[PDB]
Structures are given as C-alpha cells and as structure tokens.
Amino acid sequence: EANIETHGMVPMNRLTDDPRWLPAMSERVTRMVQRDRNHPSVIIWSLGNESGHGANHDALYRWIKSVDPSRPVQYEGGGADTTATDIICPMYARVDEDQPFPAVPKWSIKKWLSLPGETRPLILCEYAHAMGNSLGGFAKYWQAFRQYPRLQGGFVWDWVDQSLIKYDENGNPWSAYGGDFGDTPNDRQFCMNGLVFADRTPHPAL
Amino acid sequence: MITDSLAVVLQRRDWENPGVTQLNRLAAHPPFASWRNSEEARTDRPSQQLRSLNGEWRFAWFPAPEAVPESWLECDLPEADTVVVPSNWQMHGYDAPIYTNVTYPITVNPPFVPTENPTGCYSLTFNVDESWLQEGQTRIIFDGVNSAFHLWCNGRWVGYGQDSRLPSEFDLSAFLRAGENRLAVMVLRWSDGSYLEDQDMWRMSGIFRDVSLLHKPTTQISDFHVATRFNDDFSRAVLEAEVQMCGELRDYLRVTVSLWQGETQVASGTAPFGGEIIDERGGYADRVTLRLNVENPKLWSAEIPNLYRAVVELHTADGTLIEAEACDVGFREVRIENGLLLLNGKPLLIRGVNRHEHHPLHGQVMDEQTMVQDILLMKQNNFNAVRCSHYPNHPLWYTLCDRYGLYVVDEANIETHGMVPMNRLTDDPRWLPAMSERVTRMVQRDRNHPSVIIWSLGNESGHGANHDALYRWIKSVDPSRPVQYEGGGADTTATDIICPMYARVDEDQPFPAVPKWSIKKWLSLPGETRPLILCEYAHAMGNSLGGFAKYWQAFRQYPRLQGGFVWDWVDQSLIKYDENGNPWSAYGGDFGDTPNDRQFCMNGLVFADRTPHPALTEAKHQQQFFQFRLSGQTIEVTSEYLFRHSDNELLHWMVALDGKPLASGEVPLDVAPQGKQLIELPELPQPESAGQLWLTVRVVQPNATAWSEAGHISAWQQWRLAENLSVTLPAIPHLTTSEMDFCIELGNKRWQFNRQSGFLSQMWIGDKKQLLTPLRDQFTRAPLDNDIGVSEATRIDPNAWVERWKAAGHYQAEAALLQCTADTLADAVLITTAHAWQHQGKTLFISRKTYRIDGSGQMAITVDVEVASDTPHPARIGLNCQLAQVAERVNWLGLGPQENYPDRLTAACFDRWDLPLSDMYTPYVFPSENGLRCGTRELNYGPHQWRGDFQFNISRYSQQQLMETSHRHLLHAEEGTWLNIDGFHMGIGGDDSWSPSVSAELQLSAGRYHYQLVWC
Amino acid sequence: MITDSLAVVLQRRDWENPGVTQLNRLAAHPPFASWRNSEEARTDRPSQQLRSLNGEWRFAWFPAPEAVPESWLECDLPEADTVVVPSNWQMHGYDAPIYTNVTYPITVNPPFVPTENPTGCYSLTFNVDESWLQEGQTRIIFDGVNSAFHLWCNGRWVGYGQDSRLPSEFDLSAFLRAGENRLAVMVLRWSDGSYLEDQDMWRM
C-alpha cells in the first residue's frame, strides 16, 4: 500500500483531487511499484488509505495498471467501489445490515455484490475491529464468505496493539496508549486494536 | 540578501531538474479579470484591475546564466537595450532561431542542457498605485516564457516557472512597494522542459506572450467551472457552475451566477458557500455549485456559434459586490456514442487543419489581427476545426474560436520526438510530474471554452505509462470532452479516437510496432470500435495535396471516418533581408542554425504572410458543405450542415460551350441540415456549334457574415453535358532541303528543323524568330518536395522519386537521333523524327514524331513515346521550348484558374481562363515544378496557339533553374518564356512528404504514350 | 561554501512545498546488493559492496531547523549524544510521540507546517576504503526517514527526500574521500509530506 493517507482533510479528498498534489502522490505510488514489483507475495497494490476519492487516485490507478498488469489495484476511499479500485474493498461493512451514509454508504456486503452494474469481487480491506474485548459476530462474516463466491474474505483490523512501554517510578514497565506521553490532542486507547498485545501475546479474540 | 543573489539562485540549477518545474507559482485557473463591477464583467469591458505590462522593456543577452552580473538584480544594465515585449529575442537578432525537426537542438542528455545556455535578462521599471498594496493580492501573469525563467521583484527572488506555453503567475503582494518597482526576469533558452518541447518548429525563446498584473481582493473567486447538461433532444439545459473561493469564509458571503444572452438575463442563481457532502469528512465549505435551468438554449456549434455570457459575482448577503468574473458559455454536448463523435447529438465531420502559432516577422508572438485573419481564411475555405499543434495557444485564440465557430483540439505542450525510443521520458515515472503539469494546467486554464471539444495529450512522444495516467486524469476531471493522443500507434489505451498521422486511404504502411493501416482497414480491425479522425493528414509541403479528394470520398462514405486535420495551416518561413533591404522568405539553415532541417518547416496551405497556396482551393472544394449530383436535368443539392438551414445561400448555374456562356440562372437554396433539394434546370439550348457543353454551379452567400463578405462562394461543381463532335472539313508549304536543316516556307512564315539534332530549331513570323531554345521532349520535372521525400535533412530516402530519377539518369539522359526525314505531300509537308534517350547504354525513352505543316499554316505534331518498363516512371511526357516572346497574358481553355495537377484538379473548372503571366507561376519558397494547368484544349500566348488535350505550364523560369535554386528570391527571369506542354504528367502526391506518396494510378506506368498537338 | 550553509539550504523551505519531494535522489529500483560473484548472488550471501551503517550515530535534537548551529555541518556538536540508528528519537525521550487518529498533529494549513518543527541532527564519521572511490559509484541508501531530511556529506549539501516509508538513495561518489568521512542528516518531524501521512498510528 502506498504511503498516502489524508484522512484529516475536510473533505477527505481535498489534496487527492488537487493536481498540485499529483506529483507528490505519484512518487508515493510509483516508487513503491518500482521497489516491490518482483516480490511474489505482493499480489495486490493499494493506492493508500482514507484519502477520499480524487482524480489523482484515478490517474495513479491507471498508471499501475499500465506498468504492472500482473496485480490488481484496490483502494477503499470514496466509498470502496470507485473507478480507482478493481476490488470492492470496504472497511467495516456489515454482513446483513446496511449503513446508508450520504455519499459513501457502507452497504451490507451481500447486498453490495448484487447492486446493478456491480461485478467486482468484494474483499474487506478492514473488518472486525479488534479493539479490546471484541470480534463479536466474527463467525457471521465467515459464514457469509463461505456461502457467497464473490465475498472473498477480508483483512481484520488489526494485528498488534499499538501500545508503548513506559516505566513507573520504581522501574516497572507498563503499557501506555494515547495521551500517556503528554501528547495532546490524542485519541487515547484507540491505537490498541490488535488481535495480539504489543509483546505479541494473543488476545482471546485470536 | 545572500539568498536572492544569482550565485545562490542559480546554484540549484532548477532548469536541469524535472522534479522542479516551478517555484512559488500560483495555481492555474480560467482567465480572470477581477471586475469590481458586474455590468463591466457582463459586457467584457477592460478591467482596471488587470494591468498590461507589454511594451518597452530593457533587455540584455548573455551566452550563459553565469555570465549575468549581480548588479542586474538591482539596477538596469547600461549595456541593456530597449525592446518590445512580448517578443522572441531571436527575431531581434540576439542569437539565431533554430529550425530542427526531430533532432533536439541540444545534446541529448536529460535532464541536463548545455552550459552555453542563452539567457535573456528582461527588466521593467513600473509604477504600482498605492491602493493595490493596502488591500488585496497583486499577482503577475506571464502568459508565455520560453523556455524557463527566474523572477526577481525589487531585487528579491520571487519564483521560477516552466512550460513555455501556459501562464506562470506569481504573488507579488509582499514584494511590491509604493512608487517605482522593478522586475528582473532571467529567461533561459534551454531547460529540462526543453526535452518535452521538441515540436517540429522554429526553436525560439523569450517573453513571447503577454505580461500582466492582476489585482484581486483577499477574499476572491479562485476558480470556476461551467458544465452544461442536456435532455435527449437538447430542449432543456442545466448550466452547472462550480465556484471556488480563497480567503476568509464568512457567513454573509454569497455567489450569484447569472446567464445572459445579448442583453436578456436568462438564468440566475444565488447561494452561500458550501458544497454537498463529498465523503466521510464532509464537503467543500469554500465551494458552491449553482444549477441554472435554460429552456430551449441556443446551442453552440461551428456552424452557429451561439454564446451566452455567464457572470460570477462574489458578493455579501446584503448585496455588496466584492469581485466578478465571467466567461462566454456555449451550450453543446460532445460525446462519442456507438463509435461516433457526436456534437449536439449529430455526428461530426471534421474539416480540420493543424495550426502553429507562427508569424514571419514576430516569430512565435501571436496578435489578435493575425488570429482573426487565420480564422476568417479558415472558415472561408470550409474548415470547421483546428488542432493546436502542439501546445496551448494564446488565450485569445479560444475566445475567437468560441465567437467565430471553430472546433478546437487543445493539446498539451509535450513532444519528446527526438528521444530514442520516443517514449523514453513518457514511460519514466520521474518525468510524470513534469508531464502532469503540462496536461493539468492546460485543462484548468481552458476547460470553460466551448470551442475546445477534444483534449490532446501532446504529440510524438511514443506511448508511455504517463500518457495512460494523464488520459485517465482528464477523463476523471473533465468527462465532457474526449481525449486523443496519436503516439505509439494512434490507437492505444490513451486515446478515445483512432487519430493516426498520414495513414493512407487504401494503402497499408506496415511499420513494425506502429503500423499505419489504411484508415478504412483500421476501423474494422478485430475489437476496434472507436471513430477515426486523422490528427494529421495531407502533408501540404509545397506543391502538394495530391490525392486529397480520395480522403474526402472516404470520409463521406464511411461513418466512423469522421475527418481529420490537414498538416498544416501556415508556412513557418521567416523574413530575412538582402543587402539592399529587400525581404525574402527564409527557412531552415538560413540563420546559421545547424543542424537544421531546411525547407521542412514550410508545410502550409498558406504562405507565412497568409497568401494562399494553390492547394487551399482544393481543400475548400473537397470540404464544401454542399454536395451535388446531376441526374439528367436535375441538380440534387445535399447539405452537410448538421444544425443550420441554408439561409444565406444562392445557387448560380451556368451552361457554357467551351468557355462561351449559353445559359445561366439563379436558384435560392432551401435545404435542411443533412437534407436534399432538387433543382430542375430549364430547357438548355442544344447548340449547333461543335464542342462540349459544361454545366457549372456555385453556391454564393448573398449576405456577409462575421467571417465572409457578401458574394462569397462556398461550394461549386461542374459536369459535362451533351457533346457534339465536329465532323466539318477544312497555298502549299515549300520545303527547302539543306544538308544541315529542313526549312518549310509558307507565306511570311518559316519552320526550321535541324537535321543533325532532329528538332524544330527555329520558327519565323514575319522577320522575327520565335524560339530561343528548340522544341524538345522533356521527361523530367524540377522536383517537388514530395518528389524529394525528405523530412530529416540527414536521411535520404533511396526510394524517393527524385533519387530514383537521378539514379536512372533521367536528368542526364542524352537524345540519340534515330531518324529525321522530310516528305512533300500534295497539300503539306511531313517531317518524321525518332529519338532515343539513353544513360550509360540504356535506352530510357524513345520518341517518335511527325510534324505535318499544311497550307493553312498549322503544324500538326504527333508524338508516340515508349518508356522502358524497368526505368522509374517519368514525371512527365511532353515538350518544352523557350519562346522568344514575353507576353503579358496567358489565355487558354482548360481546367481552373489556379494551378492544378492530375492528383489535385477537382477544384479546378473547365472554362476560358485569362491571367497575367505572373499568375501562371506559383512562388513556392523552395522552388519546384509549379503552375501546371491540366485538361487544356487550347492555349494562347501572344500570337501562338496550341490545341489538343494537354497539360501546360508557362513562366520565365526553366525547369533547370527551378531545380537548381533553393529559394524563390534567388530566381531570375530568363530572357523568353519557357513553355512546357505535357501530354502526360505524374501526380504530385502528398499523403506524406517523406516517402513515395503518388498513388499507382497517377504514375506514368503505361509504357507507351501518345499525344497530338496543333501549333497555330 | 555559501551554498552548502544552513542559511542557504533552509531558505527555500523545501519541507513546505509539495512541488519539491526530493532533490538529487536517485531512481527507485528493486533491492540491490551488487554482487561481484554470481555464486554469492545465487546463495544470497552478504555482499561486501553493500555496507551497513546502522549502529552508533551522534544525535542532537532541536526545536526547529533554524536553531541548528552552522558548525554542525563541519564537526560533531559537543552536546550531541550517541544513539543507535535506526531508531525513532521519541523512543529515546527527545520529544513525545503523539497518538492522533484523524486530526492532524499540526495545524491544518497545507503545504505549511509549524515553525516549531522538531529537528533531529544525525551524524556519522565513517571510513570509506579507497577502492570504492577509484572506480564505480558509491550511493547511500536511507530505507526510511520520517518525515523529511536534508543530507550533507563532508560539509557539502547532497540532497533532500520525503516519503517516510520508501528508500531515499543519493550518489556520494563526488562527496566521499579516502580516510574519515562524515554524514550530517537533518531530519524534520513535519513536512508537506506529513499531509500525506495521516495514518491512525503513533506519530514519530
């Protein structure tokens, strides 16, 4: 995945729809493909994450398709099914329940496959948000993946808690999140979404 | 002040770095004027917030940027001179312009350029009023700088700009001050942008477009887009205007967009800022989109260029105007549907031409007067479309195309033709940021112009992945216009239109990875569904456009063949001056510029002073919007207009009997778009005199338009009617036999036949000799540019016709007299001759002749010519002599007033024509065979008359002098009149000019040839 | 030596300009080792032409790049510390890591970043063998620098690079010399590339 996320912009595609930022975005995509295109484990290129959908995405999608046709390109931003992705790749679309947000709805993944004119496979780039005591309803996803041929799985969010170690005054280490370093504004425990702790000990969800 | 110095600024070497195409340049946008009055914006009166800095600047030339002294940043150099800006400094004599086609003018080593890099230092002292500095933003706009430049303002470094064909704008608000200011602009001839600017044209440099100051308020309109959407019959339109602001968002802020037709306000909309939700984060709080309904909008097209005026007012909620901008709106929809390019639902037929921005005195500086002259001449010769080969033009060009009606292909300033391979940069992602700015800044500038119907990605840069990326960018940002791009084989994934250059109609050219199929064949290749429009065809280099009618037959027959763009509009000649002051047209290496490609810059339908070449009338006839068929007494007129009724059209018809008018009439045209009108001619008068009856029709426009005078002829056609062959029947000439000559006496007259040469050597009328050179067979012509077959001066085509004629010895062939006898009939004298032309013991041609001199003074000449099948087919089969007469007029019954060739004669008409003798010589800048008129049954020059069925030219320049002279101003008139009378003349070709292009049926390949002539 | 100074190099403010994402960076490519033996390349034994400069570097932290003294381009700062590279300096205590999800860690005003822009000055004295300079090309490879950096080699400015997750490579062949060399790398925490790096993670 290219090193491009402009999530804090308002709207999200404010830079990715601007041709002044097309040269900077183009280097994040093209230098990734030039570096990693011989690795067999890389099967899909991603244009980045949470940067809306802009014309720069469509351009860099087509660049990758011209330079390396051996790998699909995916990109979730701007509604998970834009012209910049070969795969319907939503984040946290539910199995049976629609979430009808105004310009970027998250249809239920069963419903999304049969929308008129939709033919791509669907692979969730993020699903089953493993924040703390979580992964409830995980079996519903895997029932749906096994039943529906174009539901070809997804990527759990995510592998490892992003906790950092701090030390108490007696020397004992402890796992720190968010604003435990005086950092502010922070988002507290939202960095810990892992199936495993930061020392790679498994959570029960694993 | 260390960082502003030339030692610091020049040390990064930003002109040798494709990752730096600009520093501190503002965003691109549509054309702004910053009106502070909405009425002034509506009427497009000149805004006092947009200041023009064109005029006198100080200029110094240096051989490299390192030679520029540091003091130039603060004060004007004493050695600097006063020059007009905009200009190209090569036109002022500071260094030479370079004409190179493919080969780059510098050493190929990207991104580096030569250390000898010619540097123009421009400066301007100028006053800024203090009301511009107390509030608002003052920006400077350079509409065009070639090729790269650094900018200082009051000694402080401002920024750096690239791309010599789009505007570079810089914020000067922190740099200006009250009182005297000073710009210092250091313009470099070569930069890394020069690798993307390898167009086949003169390589010049300087500040060659307008320079302007624009004052905007701090809260400002920063961009606006106008879209038009339609229903299926175009009876309801929605104008969608998206307006973006920069500056402080206040809740009182409003935008009103009003639509005006002439004086009536048709649609208005008022809205605060705030777009609809775009994604999870929201929408643009600094944009607002207004939708205006227009019921039955007058649609825009090249036939009827209906324009509305959109005014975009930024104003507060209590109604105080902050700033207005505006643009002309043309309501039209451009779409490709089911393989056809539609305009307003109708399939276009593109009558196009490529047009460089070229002026022979000002070089590459365009002015409104030349733009208007080009547009008028284009529309008067039935063009409806122009390709901006190969860069964004001056901003006024699109306005004039909006208002006069031309479809425009707007093309990015990207050509990397000299690279090996051609896509070496365009397939490199390091050059993707530089190419992306040439495309995206063109679309941001020109996307509101209705005349622009197609975007082009550039020209002759192979096909790389950067093309595919920028294709898809344009399709995402502006879906209202197709994208085309020829490079890499004309049918890649980077083009919506099959757009080949010089693909032939019927003949494939199967090059290894980029074949040029015949355009009929290309459409039906498996999996091919796009329309085909040639981005270049019919290469008009010199005496050319042979075979032009074959293209237009194919365009009319095949629906997905939707036309093309002729190469090209105007000769790229420049004016030089001889030592006595006389100007002359110069090409290629006439400025000491090497390597150069000589006369290949002159490919125009018109001369550089916009006088038409003879090919332009062939273009006008084939592109005419009315087509004609003659059943028997009925003329069927077909309209090829898509949108307008023939409401300014009058058919004139005339029947003549070999020039003499017998009947004529007038019929108003009343034909719908794409419809037919039947016109029944009256009872024509079946004459008694022998000869061929001819019917000629011409469509005249009785009313002037914005682009043509009253009485303008827009279309014509001629037919043969009934013919009546003559069966009527007509002293005795005395034959002197000497050992050296045969002399035939009749009355005052004498004919002399050299018995050793075998040719008629002299003629006597009264006491005066009539010939300066004997009447002799001629099989060669002074070679056209199509005969010479070169597009790069370093590479010779051994299959070129002039190479084959020279290697066969056609120009060197010596006549061997075989037979020459004389017999006295009982009513005439008959001279019989036979000659063999040989080169190194090979007989190329045999000519057998009989001269019959009767008692009525006529000389009947019969010629039978045999050509060896293994020699290359000769350019002509005819006779040539130097007449002793120099008469003023040429009078003759045959095809057309203008020069016409067997390959290029459809625009000519059979009639009696009478022109001055200078009109029978076409002054092509590179001299060649010229001035031929085909289909001639009678020719009169002074007291002489030739009859038969021949082609001729007549002039004061022999074919030898035309072949040996490189420039038309070096021609000198020879003492008599050179007469070339051809039984047979080869076509001129012109599908391209760098390969053999004469079609096989226009070549003199029959082997045996007969023609008869009567001289009286 | 005027053009190599911090007063000149920092004046363009290349980390506040999306039109400058690098200066003098070499082209990207697949992973190279430059084996001079085909058998070693086949078995992927460690190439002696690929030298690792990980280990102890000298490091100084500054609250902005303007606070970096000009003498750091020539000699190691006396107040600089010895830190392991690769590392994130927030893990060594020099400033705090920031966890922000969506909200950018700086004021949203692209392409500008705060004037308080934490600056890590890294330097390394290292020997180059003389057989590397007599022939061939010696390039330096930074596999990851967060978020932007200027590079000097023996006091001469080499180049600039952004994108904290791909390698930045620079030709050092004209800058090195036999005997002791010295890199000086000025790493900026925030740049215009930070607007493209708003992932939900710790900002280091």
Ligand SMILES: OC(O)[C@H]1NC[C@H](O)[C@@H]1O
């Ligand atoms: O694409 C055009 O610029 C080129 N094609 C042939 C023409 O003479 C010119 O060199």
Ligand SMILES: OC(O)[C@H]1NC[C@H](O)[C@@H]1O
């Ligand atoms: O796309 C990912 O980086 C984001 N989606 C939710 C997750 O917690 C993270 O913030």
Ligand SMILES: [Mg+2]
């Ligand atoms: Mg440059």
Ligand SMILES: [Mg+2]
């Ligand atoms: Mg070319």
Ligand SMILES: [Mg+2]
């Ligand atoms: Mg930058």
Ligand SMILES: [Mg+2]
């Ligand atoms: Mg995010």
Ligand code: NA
């Ligand atoms: Na499945």
Ligand code: NA
């Ligand atoms: Na998270």
Ligand code: NA
């Ligand atoms: Na057609």
Ligand code: NA
């Ligand atoms: Na040319």
